[PDB]
Design a binder for this molecule. Sequence first.
Ligand SMILES: Nc1ncnc2c1ncn2[C@@H]1O[C@H](COP(=O)(O)OP(=O)(O)O)[C@@H](O)[C@H]1O
Ligand SMILES: [Mg+2]
Ligand SMILES: [Zn+2]
Lengths: 198, 238
Amino acid sequence: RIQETQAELPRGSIPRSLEVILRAEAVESAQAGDKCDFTGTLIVVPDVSKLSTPGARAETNSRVSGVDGYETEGIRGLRALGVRDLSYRLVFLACCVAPTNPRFGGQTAESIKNQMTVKEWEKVFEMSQDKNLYHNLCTSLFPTIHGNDEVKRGVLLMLFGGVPKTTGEGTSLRGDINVCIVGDPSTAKSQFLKHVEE
Amino acid sequence: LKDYALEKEKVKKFLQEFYQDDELGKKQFKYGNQLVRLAHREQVALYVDLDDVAEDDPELVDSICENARRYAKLFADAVQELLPQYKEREVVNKDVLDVYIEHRLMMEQRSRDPGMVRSPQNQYPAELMRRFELYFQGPSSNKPRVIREVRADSVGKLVTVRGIVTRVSEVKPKMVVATYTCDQCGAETYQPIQSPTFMPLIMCPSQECQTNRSGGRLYLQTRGSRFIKFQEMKMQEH
Ligand SMILES: Nc1ncnc2c1ncn2[C@@H]1O[C@H](COP(=O)(O)OP(=O)(O)O)[C@@H](O)[C@H]1O
Ligand SMILES: [Mg+2]
Ligand SMILES: [Zn+2]
């Protein structure tokens, strides 16, 4: 089940939802919450919809008629003529799925490196070798927020995270950090949240 | 167990020769004038006063109260048969149903063949050509009942009750006589409705289709069909 992206929404409308069918080799490529481009063919699949009102029906053109005692009427008549409702729902038969905005042009560090393109890996290596990368990343993430250098640093370290561990006894030592901003009204708390979300 | 032809003649006599001084001491033949207006199609509902009926024939009022639906139909048929002899000018075709009625009557006259005996299923249902309704104004003698006291002994009886309206639905179209048109013969089938529901017809019974032994499927039409404003309310005990 996929739904309309936020950008495409008209005014005062719920995001339209439809189901896409992934056949062989595309069967576990789309995951919940991801933004994905599906390429395929819009199709119609028959559905037994609980429409209270009669609509379109399909019946044979053969001009049969029931004899006395077997009058082709009522349920018997419908079953004899083969009357069947024609109700359809639009479904998408996606022959392929790709990420809408791929992270790499091409899950360990080596695998990510290979997935990266030559230019992308060169840029990543340059940033890694760049001293002052801390302040650079802070400014890039929050260029439009003045001050709050400590808050920006904390949010950056949150985005990076620590190393979760599991003790010999099985206790799962938390590895990711949580950050809470408490402050006076109109102090960019919601803005920090929106920056991180975007 | 009574002769309904005689009862019909009695109700016809009442409707045709009843009079009162409702207008400043002027004998005006109340129900005659109402019949005139009904024929002219300037009036839809006709309210027969059982007080007026009892003014001459109390036992007829008793029979009506004991079996109202039957006598409602008898009065309706009497008015139907009486309208032509009170008609004085041409109806202005108030609505689409009037257009349909005039078309059907015209083509029936066209294909009349007066002497030929027609199958009973080969005529227009009476309710399909009414354009009027007949109701009873309960007699003053009948004391109003109580919703709790109106029980099986009153089934089919003309009871008068009083109460508070706790609810009423909105006027809906309830089908009285379904109409169907065939894809082979160009003849109209009709299905009067008495049950709360119905099963739409599949095959056409027209003489032409039966002769040709064609498939003769027919389609339900909201155009030629007849509807009536329908409301469902709930009255409550005082
Ligand atoms: N220090 C700041 N730097 C940049 N913009 C700010 C700053 N403080 C407030 N604003 C602006 O004021 C508004 C209030 O921010 P908001 O996130 O709503 O604060 P709060 O979380 O208290 O509601 C935002 O539109 C934000 O852009
Ligand atoms: Mg806020
Ligand atoms: Zn037919």
